[PDB]
């Protein structure tokens, strides 16, 4: 039920091997301190700049998404911590509660 | 005499640091076996295929340029080796040369 032509299946295998040979070539380049000249040969100046900005875009997305979780958690905890104090205050004995009211001036 | 605006000089430094941060990020990704997913995040499918084909293009250029040097060298050596044999044959003594002609039947 695969339903794929031998031509398309051979091209997909070709692109897969060509991609795997590049990442392996780049890996050995880092191990030989040749990554910088290889990237200058493999990439255009506009593609190198695009990659540099995309890292910053990922950084701003992660920082933006994490900062929205922190305000979501701090606002929720600020409400959850009030309810914990309310329940604990209801459970306190009268001798403590009435003494707190006398220090409630 | 540099004659460059502070705006352009700051942007060139920004692109340089962004590019250096990417290659450093990719280096640590190879050391952490995270290169394959990082490249899938940083590159589009069309850009990954372009890089895979460019490696093959470099391979065919190097193989093509080297094969042209080998035929250039083999044709030149084939001429240089005939002249060496001609000179060495002129320098040979008569007793050898005349004996070679008697085995020249
Ligand atoms: N004894 C309280 C302590 C506490 C938690 N959150 C609070 C907020 C206000 C006052 C007290 C608390 C408790 O177990 O939950
Ligand atoms: N004695 C010859 C050997 C040699 C080199 N090339 C040759 C070609 C043909 C015959 C002999 C040779 C030399 O020193 O050069």
Author numbering:
A (entry chain A), B (entry chain A): 1 to 105
The authors write:
Tryptophan repressor (TrpR) was one of the earliest gene-regulatory proteins for which a high-resolution crystal structure was determined in complex with its DNA regulatory site. The TrpR dimer is formed from deeply intertwined monomers and is related to domain-swapped proteins, even though it does not meet a proposed definition predicated on the existence of a stably folded monomeric structure, which TrpR apparently does not have. Formation of the extended domain-swapped structure depends on the conversion of two interhelical turns in each subunit of native dimeric TrpR into helical segments, resulting in the formation of a continuous, nearly straight α-helix of 47 residues. TrpR crystals in the typical native dimeric form have previously been reported for a variant in which Val58 is replaced by isoleucine (Val58Ile), one of 19 TrpR mutants created by Arvidson et al. to explore the role of the identity of the residue at position 58, which forms part of the l-Trp-binding site.
The structures of free and l-Trp-soaked cleaved Val58Ile ds-TrpR were determined to 2.05 and 2.45 Å resolution, respectively, and refined to an R work/R free of 26.8/29.9% and 27.8/29.1%, respectively. In the l-Trp-soaked form distinct changes are observed in the side-chain conformations of Arg84, which comes within hydrogen-bonding distance of the l-Trp carboxylate, and of Thr81, which rotates to within hydrogen-bondimg distance of the indole ring N atom. The l-Trp ligand has an average B factor of ∼75 Å2, which is lower than the overall B factor of the structure (96 Å2) and is in the range of the surrounding residues (∼70–90 Å2). In the second chain of dimeric TrpR the backbone carbonyl O atoms of Leu41 and Leu43 are positioned to interact with the l-Trp α-amino group, with Asn40 as an additional potential hydrogen-bonding partner. All of these potential ligand interactions are maintained in Val58Ile ds-TrpR, except that the origin of Arg54 is a third protein chain rather than the first chain as in dimeric TrpR. In the domain-swapped form the long extended helix positions Arg54 away from the ligand-binding site formed by residues of its own chain, bringing it instead into an equivalent position at the ligand-binding site of the next dimer-like node of the extended array.
